[PDB]
């Protein structure tokens, strides 16, 4: 019998998977239609591609959750297969951060962004944002092994810094600090300055600027706080403790709650985009 | 063994 | 191109390179700030053009790492409605009026004055269907001649429904408010009014600030944040 | 004065006499005569070729003599000579003035004429020993925007400007030899007879005038429109021509019978026509309305037999090949489409 | 004194423009119909030609 | 327009013209996107272009020839100063008197009519002590700047160059050259002796 935490998480995975696949396919097609002429489209093209690639592999997690750690893939897949989605999610986070950093540069200093604003700089920034996830993903590649149970047959995929305690502490500190503090601070500071400069001239004053900014920042923070706060505690705290088992029970709910943002992301672009219907008809 | 992600 | 012959692939390469040339050339036309200048000819158009500068007349000038292309179309002397749609995406409109011509009368008809002609032409330009979201700057030049003409001859001739102190400041404020009253949108279009004599030190700063605000608004709208 | 009043009365009674004489011969209508012809089937045209490359705003196009090449003019100072078969860009010519409104292609495939809104019309030599395209002659003398320009011969050209005047030029000398005047409103379009002996022009005052090249002065005047004239073109026979105005109505005229043959208009369209063209047989008419799509009409029955709805913006220019293998339609959003 | 000169020019134009012959509309209609019927044989647009000999046929390119 | 021979450009846009060498050596298109070499000497000679100085270098009689490729173009217009399909001409020398027609025959081994309809045969004449001049391109069209007397016609694998009216200025050596596919092969030299 499945536990109470598992069923609600499973339902969230199913719903978010379906809606995210549909929305990501639509956004990918729409932004790939007009990638050549518009600088803004290529920014969210990478967002849609990364989120779609992350969302495609969820049914593997669905199958592994519905049955008791069903892993019919062997030890070869345990090394690399999780790392694909693990990299894709962090790449999407970094892409959101770089979009938020581009908006501030658009608002401030509007003369430099006229003479020397080309697509090459945007492409380089997107490439760097994509590359930065590889550094975080590499320790996942190096530290994954497989365990066999000669008791009633089970297999278990999971990292095991045997006695590299210090390595695990260091990598956990680096991934938590970077991946949550840096984007959160970047978005909040850039958006605060954008609002405080946009609401200082009657020509540029508008109400739509607040409703998008606050929605994005609140959704990101609320929907990604629990997963990181529980995962980092699971990372420092030793397995030989009941609270570690409790964190292992809450892990599925935490990861599902974090994933929800994948489905949340393109609704903002679709709803708050100019002429989305006409753009879809054009393609 | 820390089953799963991380 | 397996099917292409020896002299057909070269044509494809030439077409591709012409495509590259045009793509390169088309990115240098979006980095210019386009201004369209309008007036009544005798309202001080030529003096303003000579002042802010260091068929159709095209002028180019640079100020604070920004390039401005000015189009003067006062010499066309043709129907306005047949070619105005060409200036559909102009960055800004500049309008020139002399406020010292209230007492002056047009040569064609002594009853009609130049002030009413300027007001009606401003009304026609402001409510155009191709300029729904185009910024307009208004320039009122030759304020001195107006201030020495306001004392010998009162402004009640031009405005019989005006009751004030018959001073320069009140008359200027009334004219400026009347000129702003021609707006019908007040949401996406804003009129900037300035006063300057023959000697000037800040008109270029005024137009630079206006175009900077326009560029900021356009950039905000482009990314969907606005 | 008394003389002015009496001369105005005399002019009015000449106009009345002319109207009476014109109405005297109005005994039958074209629709009654052509009411027995079987109607043409649904003309389904698909975009065989899509020509792209303009990064700016298109105004005019013209087909070639061999029905393989064509020329287009854009707002970024670009005149492009295409290749309609293999979709290749044969030539790209920069323009000194970016405000272009019309373009002309020589019947010998040697020269191209470009001008508009600058009082100057430039001629570029396509077949140059240097291998490039350079300006050969500049014609100036007009006090209004040039609206149309067309080639009479390899040495003769006719241009209509915005100062209510048409002018016949010689590239060899560069000076006008004939001036056509008489229009109160601005001239917007002109067309040439197949024999290159007479040409019609349309004005903004809803009036079309026929002019003789040899004598150099007007012959006949046609009226009936209620708004500005936009496009005009002769019938392939050369004894009739169709005019499309801004009031959402096209009319068919005649040279011998000075009356109205047919009028093309629809209730669901309240916007004018920008370009008008014919086919090889004169049975099919193409009218590019400014409602984001073109229209196809049966010239002998005033019936719609096809819609060329493939553009996302207003329609400006349209052309038909000399032998009528296919048609070409430019648009206001920097795209060309060849329909067949 | 340009009004009388312009009026003289206009009345001379009207004198010249009222010296043309006219024919019945049915004759012109019949001539146009005959031309259209005669030239309908060589109209690719009026009658869809087979794609074998079509120069603008929709190829794979 | 003129070419002074490496080589040099003066009086025309060198950046919009393809370049050939005439046997054939190498071919370089505009922008150096497509470069073709001769199978016999590939490896020892190299071709390079310098647009700013309008100079084409050949690291190693040789001739450099202009060309341009678009509809209605006339490639091999200017010849400067100075498996494989085989072209053969049986005729080697024919005495002739001005005022009578002359026929010269050039053969092939396959069908030179490409799917685009272009028959890539180039008849050109070389006067004694003079650089060769193009006479007929694509076997159906006449060149420019040359007398109208020369003509040509043919079909299948047999082509002929004809002179209707002959004068004293027609003495020279005639060549038929193929351009269907690379490398370019030349026919046997056909000399006319007065």
Task: Describe what is shown at a glance.
Helix content of chain A is 77%, strand content 4%. In chain C, strands 2-3-1-4-5-6 form a six-stranded mixed beta sheet, with helices on both faces.
Task: Kindly describe this structure.
- Chain E: One of its GO terms (molecular function) is G-protein beta-subunit binding.
- Chain E: Keywords: Acetylation, Cell membrane, Host-virus interaction, Lipoprotein, Membrane, Methylation, Prenylation, Transducer.
- Chain E: It is found in: Cell membrane.
- Chain E: InterPro entries: G-protein_gamma-like_dom (IPR015898), GGL_sf (IPR036284), Gprotein-gamma (IPR001770).
- The complex is a heterohexamer of chains A (283), B (6), C (226), D (340), E (61) and F (194).
- Helix content of chain A is 77%, strand content 4%.
- Chain A has 283 residues and is mostly helical.
- In chain A, β1 and β2 form a beta hairpin.
- The longest helix of chain A has 34 residues.
- Chain C has one domain: Rossmann fold.
- Chain C has a six-stranded mixed β-sheet with strand order 2-3-1-4-5-6, sandwiched between helices.
- In chain C, β2 and β3 form a beta hairpin.
- Chain E has a single domain, classed as G Protein Gi Gamma 2 (Irregular), CATH 4.10.260.10.
- In chain E, 51% of the residues lie in helices and 0% in strands.
- Chain E starts with a helix and ends in a 22-residue tail after the last helix.
- Chains in contact: A-B, A-C, C-D, C-F, D-E, D-F.
- Chains D and E meet through α1 and β17 of D and α1 and α2 of E.
Gap between N and C termini of chain C: 48 Å
What helical percentage do the residues of chain C reach? 25-40%
β-strand percent of chain C reads 15-25%
Share of residues in helices of chain B: under 10%
Oligomer: heterohexamer
Q: What percent of residues of chain B are in strands?
A: under 5%
Biggest pleated sheet of chain B: none
Provide the number of structural domains of chain C: 1
Please name the fourth-level CATH homologous superfamily of chain C. Answer: P-loop containing nucleotide triphosphate hydrolases
Distance between the termini of chain B: 11 Å
Alpha carbon gyration radius of chain B: 5 Å
- Pair with the biggest interface: D-E, 64 and 39 residues
Helix and strand string of chain C, N-terminal first? Answer: HEHEEEHEHHEH
Global shape of chain C: elongated
Number of strands of chain B: 0
Radius of gyration of chain C: 23 Å
CATH class of chain C: Alpha Beta
